[PDB]
Write a protein that binds this ligand. Sequence first.
Ligand SMILES: Nc1nc(=O)c2c([nH]1)NC[C@H](CCc1ccc(C(=O)N[C@@H](CCC(=O)O)C(=O)O)cc1)C2
Length: 159
Amino acid sequence: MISLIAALAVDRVIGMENAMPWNLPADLAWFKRNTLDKPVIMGRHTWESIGRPLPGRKNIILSSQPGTDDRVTWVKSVDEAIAACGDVPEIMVIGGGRVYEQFLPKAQKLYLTHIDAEVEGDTHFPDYEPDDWESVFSEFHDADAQNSHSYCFEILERR
Ligand SMILES: Nc1nc(=O)c2c([nH]1)NC[C@H](CCc1ccc(C(=O)N[C@@H](CCC(=O)O)C(=O)O)cc1)C2
């Protein structure tokens, strides 16, 4: 099945690491445990800002142009992207904005981190109709030593 994973600030705003003002190791830990050993699909900008392939995951990059790095798999369409995953139980889509928009209608689960930090940004996570999803898990954490902001993890599933 297809699953989306994103970190959202107030107002579902999303942005690249360096663009984001918060510092949450715990969220990274979470992102990591939910992605390990699964194929990860991301848009070219996200790939470029990540800067190296995610270890322990098959990395598939979406780009309308030919690939420029042999350490990852390059694809040219959403359909080709899903096909390159093979038969796996769950495919994780990691952004960006444009990739989220494209895969949402096809997703069955959403792993979201809600961050309490109002930031002025460019992109918003796509709007998901409250009617189609059911929250199946949540967990709040306040800020701390390591974590700069209070955050809440949540998993939703398509009803
Ligand atoms: N939950 C969540 N948090 C985020 O910050 C992001 C999302 N999702 N999804 C989209 C996007 C992807 C950006 C992104 C993804 C991974 C790493 C990363 O380094 N992952 C390492 C974590 C290293 C560590 O343990 O901190 C990894 O191996 O997964 C950095 C930025 C940023």
